[PDB]
Design a protein around this ligand. Structure first.
Ligand SMILES: Nc1ncnc2c1ncn2[C@@H]1O[C@H](COP(=O)(O)OP(=O)(O)OP(=O)(O)O)[C@@H](O)[C@H]1O
Ligand SMILES: [Mg+2]
Lengths: 47, 53, 62, 501
């Protein structure tokens, strides 16, 4: 009897979905700031 | 052995002889030219640097 | 050894065959078709170079 | 041709004989129920009229249940079954080396016929308790992890267990290829005559395999039995014993052999089909009650004869496949309690980049220190202790920092050793090169070198040692120990090289 790696997501329990939740915060916020920065960049390049 | 198994009339020894006649092109020294480098480097170190040092 | 008529039967069918070997008797055009297909496939496995000479190279130096 | 056909006809056996006989009552699913054959020995080879074979496996009081060695499309209720009186036997000798034979020792390679002289049964008994002598010599597999942490002596059963596509056959074939250096050399006390039994594989896989072996010119000393997926159940149930008898010939002829069963979980399935069709009572997972006797009487032929019976040997590396690390299933536990070890392979390790994906935590060998050379023993004792220490606290790895410098050292050593154990495919290494690399690894001559580069170092080091200091390696190899002079010389080479890179 043993365990595996990357198994807190397969169970789909409470943690399996809270983990999706946490990751999705982090990367939604990062995507927002990255989109703003890319905008800023192209708008600056108009000059 | 080839002639033995190879019932072909003469192609066996035909190619045998032709092969034995054919000779490979040995490559020729063409990079082999920068030797003065050594000597002129020798100058930089042994003449242009020896006396100044 | 000739006591078994089977041996002589096979033997003289064989003989008549060898005498007929002036050509491959009763080859049948399907024989030729099989030859065709497999001979091509063999050649492609062996390449397309003319199978008669010493294909020259004229090797390239650095 | 024609002229050859003449003696092809002549070279026959036309004679007839007064033979016993029984007539088929029934047929279907590959199981004839012959009626008659009153004097047929259990487990005997009968021949049907059409031309097939059969192994009269189930002597019931009124009929004999025979198992056909092929499609029974050729058999009909009413056919004649004539007994031969001879238990199943197979050809043996050194004529087989380099050939490919099927379960019954019939060349399926084209390439002419087998010119064997002496045959041999397939249901012999294993050597007793007195003939054997303790396992002492090593079988260099050429794989760092196998050859240092989980050694394999000659005369030892070493299960190679693991899930699907983790590299079990690759380990076996690296082992087969490694023996080339011995089998080309001189001494006859280090030549291993590998055998490879392919069960349940498709003929394409065995063809690719023999291609690999031929490329490395490793066929001149290998036999390759093959009961592939299309061959009726009896020929898969019976191939391992054909291989084991071909190997027993060497073993009792004072030679050293090595037999690789691949898989042994596709032989038990074939035996289950045979039994369930013969209507024998089923058991757990539907396997009969003999699926332990089956394997046990096979893997107990791998012995190491003493010096009064010749001094021969027969290793055995049964490859087993476990369904998602379910080592508790029936067959995995049946074959784990027969053998002297296990080389566990895992996919978490295979995809982390640790290839070969050996899981040193679960892999053990119950000979242990013995079955190693004194040099490899000296290196591997410290390596094993260091790796165990690293494993017991690897859980912290993802943090690393924020922790004591002692555990930081432990992680910085374990990572280096793990990276050193990584190996390529079909690139086995002589024992001296393994000792050199793992010496440069366990003595701290890499702790200051970033892990990502270790592999580079390894290769470079070998190129810088093989081409430069073959004398030192020969000194280590001929006497398999590190004399203080050799130790210091290794230290100097490691230090100066690392400085020069
Ligand atoms: N040392 C290695 N380095 C890199 N890749 C490897 C190594 N060993 C095995 N592999 C890869 O693992 C794959 C499977 O190998 P292999 O057939 O040996 O495993 P297997 O368990 O026998 O497969 P199966 O169980 O399906 O027969 C191969 O495609 C090979 O590329
Ligand atoms: Mg395999």
């Amino acid at each position: 009897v043993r365990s595996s790696a990357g198994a807190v997501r397969d169970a789909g329990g409470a943690f399996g979905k809270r983990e999706q939740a946490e990751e999705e915060r982090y990367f939604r916020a990062r995507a927002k700031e990255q989109l703003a920065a890319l905008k800023k960049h192209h708008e600056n390049e108009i000059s | 052995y080839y002639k033995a198994n190879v019932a072909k009339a003469g192609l066996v020894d035909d190619f045998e002889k032709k092969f034995n006649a054919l000779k490979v092109p040995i490559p020729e020294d063409k990079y082999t030219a920068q030797v003065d480098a050594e000597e002129k480097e020798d100058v930089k170190s042994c003449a242009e640097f020896l006396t100044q040092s | 050894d000739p006591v078994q008529k089977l041996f002589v039967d096979k033997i003289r069918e064989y003989r008549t065959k060898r005498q007929t070997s002036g050509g491959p008797v009763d080859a049948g055009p399907e024989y030729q078709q099989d030859l065709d297909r497999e001979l091509f496939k063999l050649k492609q496995m062996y390449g397309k170079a003319d199978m008669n000479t010493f294909p020259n190279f004229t090797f390239e130096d650095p | 041709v024609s002229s050859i056909l003449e003696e092809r006809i002549l070279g026959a056996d036309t004679s007839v004989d007064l033979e016993e006989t029984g007539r088929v009552l029934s047929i279907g699913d590959g199981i004839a129920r012959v009626h008659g054959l009153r004097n047929v020995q259990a487990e005997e080879m009968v021949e049907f009229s059409s031309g097939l074979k059969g192994m009269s496996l189930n002597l019931e009081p009124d009929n004999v249940g025979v198992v056909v060695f092929g499609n029974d499309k050729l058999i009909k209720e009413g056919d004649i079954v004539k007994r031969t009186g001879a238990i199943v036997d197979v050809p043996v000798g050194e004529e087989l080396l380099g050939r490919v034979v099927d379960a019954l020792g019939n060349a399926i390679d084209g390439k002419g016929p087998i010119g064997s002289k002496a045959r041999r049964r397939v249901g012999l008994k294993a050597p007793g308790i007195i003939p054997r002598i303790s396992v002492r010599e090593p079988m260099q597999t050429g794989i760092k992890a196998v050859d240092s942490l989980v050694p394999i002596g000659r005369g030892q059963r070493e299960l190679i267990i693991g899930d699907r596509q983790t590299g079990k056959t690759s380990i076996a074939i690296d082992t087969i290829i490694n023996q080339k250096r011995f089998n080309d050399g001189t001494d006859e006390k280090k030549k291993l005559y590998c055998i490879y039994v392919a069960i349940g594989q498709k003929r394409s896989t065995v063809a690719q395999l023999v291609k690999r072996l031929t490329d490395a010119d490793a066929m001149k000393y290998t036999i390759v039995v093959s009961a592939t997926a299309s061959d009726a159940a009896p020929l898969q149930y019976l191939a391992p014993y054909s291989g084991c008898s071909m190997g027993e010939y060497f073993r009792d002829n004072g030679k050293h052999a090595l037999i690789i069963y691949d898989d042994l979980s596709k032989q038990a399935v074939a035996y289950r089909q045979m039994s369930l069709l013969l209507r024998r009572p089923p058991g757990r997972e539907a396997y009969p009650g003999d699926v332990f006797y089956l394997h046990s009487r096979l893997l107990e032929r791998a012995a190491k004869m003493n010096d009064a019976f010749g001094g021969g040997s027969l290793t055995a590396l049964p490859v087993i496949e476990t369904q998602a690390g379910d080592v508790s299933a029936y067959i995995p536990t049946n074959v784990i309690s027969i053998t002297d070890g296990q080389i566990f392979l895992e996919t978490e390790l295979f995809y982390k980049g640790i290839r070969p994906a050996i899981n040193v935590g679960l892999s053990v060998s119950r000979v242990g220190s013995a079955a190693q050379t004194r040099a490899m023993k000296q290196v591997a004792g410290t390596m094993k202790l260091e790796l165990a220490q690293y494993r017991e606290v690897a859980a912290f790895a993802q943090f690393g920092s924020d922790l004591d410098a002692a555990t930081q050292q432990l992680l910085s050593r374990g990572v280096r050793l793990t990276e050193l154990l990584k190996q390529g495919q079909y690139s086995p290494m002589a024992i001296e090169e393994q000792v050199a690399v793992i010496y440069a690894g366990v003595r701290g001559y890499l702790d200051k070198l970033e892990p990502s580069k270790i592999t580079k170092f390894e290769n470079a080091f070998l190129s810088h040692v093989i081409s430069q200091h073959q004398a030192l390696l020969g000194k280590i190899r001929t006497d398999g120990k590190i004399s203080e002079e050799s130790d210091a010389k290794l230290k100097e080479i490691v230090t100066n090289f690392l400085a020069g890179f």
